[PDB]
Design a protein around this ligand. Sequence first.
Ligand SMILES: [Zn+2]
Ligand SMILES: [Zn+2]
Lengths: 181, 179
Amino acid sequence: SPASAVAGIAAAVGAAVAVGKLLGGPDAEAGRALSEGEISLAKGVFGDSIDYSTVRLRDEDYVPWQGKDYVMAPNGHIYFGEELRGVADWSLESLQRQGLFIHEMTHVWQHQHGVNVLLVGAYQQARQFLLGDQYAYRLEPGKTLKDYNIEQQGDIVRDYFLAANAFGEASANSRFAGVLK
Amino acid sequence: ASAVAGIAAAVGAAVAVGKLLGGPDAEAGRALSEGEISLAKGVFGDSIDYSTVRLRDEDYVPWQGKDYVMAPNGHIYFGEELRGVADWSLESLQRQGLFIHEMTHVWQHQHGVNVLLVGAYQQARQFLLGDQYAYRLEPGKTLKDYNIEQQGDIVRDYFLAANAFGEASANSRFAGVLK
Ligand SMILES: [Zn+2]
Ligand SMILES: [Zn+2]
């Protein structure tokens, strides 16, 4: 069983390097670019920290093993699954659907700030599965965003956006002020 | 620590390439020539369907070498330095031996072997665990008791012995390993 852990994690990173090297870098001209409302939505969270020009919404899977009800953001482009296709404007969808979009955008923000969301992601996803680590983040004093895994990083940012839209900036900034910089 | 990691990462990358570009385009590449079918028939006979077999003068993966050849799916992928060969049967005996070696994997694939996974595992295990790549014939050891790669070398070296020293000298040395 501890033999399965090292093996499983390495095999998952190996598969990530393979996909990375194989279909290396996305076609800037392919997909669809962010809408006026979508740029506004993300600007309210990320501001001018990300170049929204780069960001592309592709209604196609990144890999054949990607789920029907799943979304990937490895290269700074967002790949929508079979059940999440046909959305022209994410800013004109439900608050929970908008939250999903802010989540994927955090991976796009990570990528734009020098993070290998493909490798780092594959490693952390496999490590939390086999090493049984808790899926849900737990806020701690002295812990910044960067001390969490790339998926929790997203969950945090999304949950902040949802708190700020549902309970106002007052309630949101009190809880998330520590973790964000 | 590096061994378990390295081997698993190598098999993981193989499953990824396998799942990703799964199965080759039967109509793509180039099919075996009359001479090439004859060449292989003398070794493999009617054990393989030569119709399936396709010679593609393109890399299987970007990390494949200039002086390297891959045969993972029952199609042969030629590297940068091995391109432009219209007929392998009209090339040097050593160049024909290479072709028989690649054909052994094509024969393994056609007989139920996952050349991609089994290969990636064995190649990585032989590198990190520093195990002897070069086969050494042993009594009681059948071809199936050797690496998918050794299996390729054994069959090729047999073909070369049979062409250079005749079937007499070749069949005396290789009769044991082959069935
Ligand atoms: Zn995600
Ligand atoms: Zn080979």
